[PDB]
């Protein structure tokens with residue numbers, strides 16, 4: 095069954111990819127080659143062109159992503175040549191540096207060798223390459239609760255954090271053939287962080303909030319033409335609400351709205367005062383202001399939705415069906431001020447695509 | 457087929473209803489009676505108890521409603537006895553008066569005779585019993601665009617509005633056997649309206665906004681045990697976001713956010729300033745403040761979601777399955793500050809329930 099599944103996915107992908115690349119005439123011959131290769135080896139290897147375009151298609155097909163207008167400008171780094179943990183580490187460091195680009199963030203994906211027999215070659219444990227630790231013990235909560243299980247796993251392995259609310263987790267990944275992952279502390283020279291200040295409320299800095307500049311998601315599987323790239327970290331840049339409305343606001347994350355209300359000078363006593371809503375707006379204004387001030391790319395949810403409308407229009411012009419997940423595309427503040435709220439989307443799954451996979455810790 | 461459909465719905469409803477009322481032992485005999493009645497007449501008539509409990513169950517099963525905690529306190533007015541247009545008009549006037557209750561709004565439904573052969577006895581044209589007219593001509597837009605087609609239909613019938621932005625539409629409904637509906641101007645003594653002011657921005661009154669106190673939805677069909685009550689106007693009280701985030705804010709409704717931004721003293725020039733979000737918060741604060749000041753019932757979205765969580769808990773305690781439509785239950789401002797955003801809901805349709813039906817105008 096496995097081989098047949100692979101061959102079917104390969105036939106669909108190659109046809110579509112080569113069609114999009116103006117290479118329709120090469121399909122027959124390429125498919126023949128792939129079919130022999132599957133017979134004799136159990137798999138097939140993508141050309142560089144296939145791999146690049148496949149990673150772009152996968153972004154274009156990500157139903158939950160409002161940022162898809164820019165799918166064709168993904169910078170694809172092909173690292174299928176890595177064999178050692180130093181090579182992996184150095185590729186991840188490189189990805190951070192080139193994606194960061196001094197703050198003018200470049201959407202980038204680094205693709206490592208794919209699973210073979212469902213056997214991973216490289217297994218990345220980080221949820222994002224840059225992310226803060228979380229601790230919970232003796233009633234005491236420090237840092238990012240979303241990171242508690244991974245933090246615990248790192249500390250089992252000899253890493254120890256300073257126990258600030260913003261400790262950078264080490265890179266942590268496992269190689270085929272090793273029982274345990276290895277970990278490496280992130281060089282601070284590679285990591286841009288943004289202190290959160292507010293454009294006109296001076297006290298906002300008293301909250302001592304910060305966040306990291308570049309979200310590099312490193313635990314999803316890229317599937318292209320039946321090949322499973324389980325290790326393929328990618329990034330765009332933030333939409334401000336991801337930080338201001340969720341990471342810093344959720345009760346199960348940094349839970350900052352009461353503190354925000356206090357520094358902006360409003361009571362947090364009555365639901366009818368809409369103080370949470372007001373605090374959310376000011377915290378989100380601060381996040382956008384702060385990234386812009388530090389010269390780190392970010393987009394607000396209004397501009398993001400406007401770009402997404404153009405993506406809808408582009409798909410139409412291209413004669414491509416549009417898929418989307420309304421429940422994730424709407425922003426978590428003022429969703430009905432965006433066009434997204436007022437239309438519906440077909441949440442069908444089209445491949446190539448990015449998929450969740452099981453956590454190796456937990 | 458029609459009769460079989462009716463009988464099946466009747467069997468399911470009576471069983472469930474009588475179970476909930478502690479009348480399980482009466483089911484067999486009641487079903488027998490209903491079955492003969494369907495045979496001989498083509499339909500059956502609900503007892504008063506059945507009708508009351510059925511309208512309550514229908515509210516309880518309304519997946520899109522965040523207000524369902526209070527389903528069992530619905531005041532059910534049985535008007536299956538009406539035969540004349542004066543009786544209909546007077547029942548609608550009565551519903552407005554008793555539901556309004558001097559501002560301490562009573563959730564109420566008035567139930568008119570049901571369809572017979574799919575033949576309506578009374579057909580109400582209003583979307584809500586109290587609602588503002590809309591006009592669009594010669595580029596000129598006045599009032600509520602959502603009401604343009606019904607307004608045009610009323611004016612075809614000899615009604616003429618003053619062409620303010622808040623003209624009250626007349627009651628308009630048709631009787632079986634009449635070709636045209638009749639219309640009646642609403643007595644202003646029956647209609648409470650709330651001027652919108654802001655708790656601390658004095659200029660907010662310069663916008664001259666107002667809204668009506670009680671939303672009385674009068675164009676949905678109540679279905680109970682296979683009987684179709686197409687005319688059964690009901691009301692609760694507003695959640696503030698329905699007025700402040702949608703009716704007064706949507707670009708295709710009163711479209712007030714730029715004007716709000718100006719009176720609250722913020723620029724409406726840059727998406728990154730989140731001025732729409734800020735204007736939405738202040739407009740919603742004003743709406744809640746204004747209703748509370750006038751002594752007219754209203755609920756904010758935080759308190760509403762907290763009540764809805766108790767509804768979820770109540771259903772659990774009662775051993776009843778919960779259904780809901782996440783896409784409608786989340787409020788349109790700060791949705792992720794409510795528990796609703798963070799869970800999922802089974803959007804299955806359970807009857808009794810309230811359903812949309814085709815507009816007789818348009």
Ligand SMILES: Nc1ccc2ccc(CNCCCc3cccc(F)c3)cc2n1
Nearest residue numbers: 191194195196197282283284285286287
């Ligand atoms: N005490 C701490 C904690 C975390 C820290 C993280 C980063 C840094 C220093 N970051 C410098 C990043 C400069 C930079 C600029 C442009 C591109 C790039 F990749 C890095 C210091 C920290 N100091």
Ligand SMILES: Nc1ccc2ccc(CNCCCc3cccc(F)c3)cc2n1
Nearest residue numbers: 161221240309311329330331332333336
């Ligand atoms: N700006 C972007 C671009 C791409 C993105 C891809 C994935 C995600 C993360 N989605 C959430 C993964 C599940 C989750 C939720 C909350 C906390 C947590 F640690 C993980 C954010 C992105 N944000």
Ligand SMILES: Nc1ccc2ccc(CNCCCc3cccc(F)c3)cc2n1
Nearest residue numbers: 553556557558559644645646647648649
């Ligand atoms: N120019 C206008 C336009 C619309 C109007 C609507 C209502 C009224 C007067 N409304 C009085 C309502 C008083 C009231 C109190 C308690 C219960 C109740 F049903 C009505 C005047 C208008 N005047």
Ligand SMILES: Nc1ccc2ccc(CNCCCc3cccc(F)c3)cc2n1
Nearest residue numbers: 523583602671673691692693694695698
């Ligand atoms: N507070 C309540 C209680 C019950 C409600 C029942 C129905 C509705 C109306 N739902 C919208 C019907 C479709 C629609 C959307 C926008 C404008 C318009 F005229 C009609 C509001 C309620 N609001």
Ligand SMILES: C[C@H](O)[C@H](O)[C@H]1CNc2nc(N)[nH]c(=O)c2N1
Nearest residue numbers: 421422423424796797798799800
């Ligand atoms: C339970 C629910 O699906 C959950 O809150 C979802 C809803 N929509 C979302 N949308 C985005 N963009 N991100 C999220 O984390 C979520 N959470």
Ligand SMILES: C[C@H](O)[C@H](O)[C@H]1CNc2nc(N)[nH]c(=O)c2N1
Nearest residue numbers: 434435436437438783784785786
């Ligand atoms: C097109 C989309 O379904 C539409 O905007 C829905 C979404 N959620 C909603 N939720 C509520 N409560 N009311 C609405 O009018 C809508 N509109």
Ligand SMILES: [Cl-]
Nearest residue numbers: 309336337341
């Ligand atoms: Cl994040």
Ligand SMILES: [Cl-]
Nearest residue numbers: 671698699703
């Ligand atoms: Cl309304």
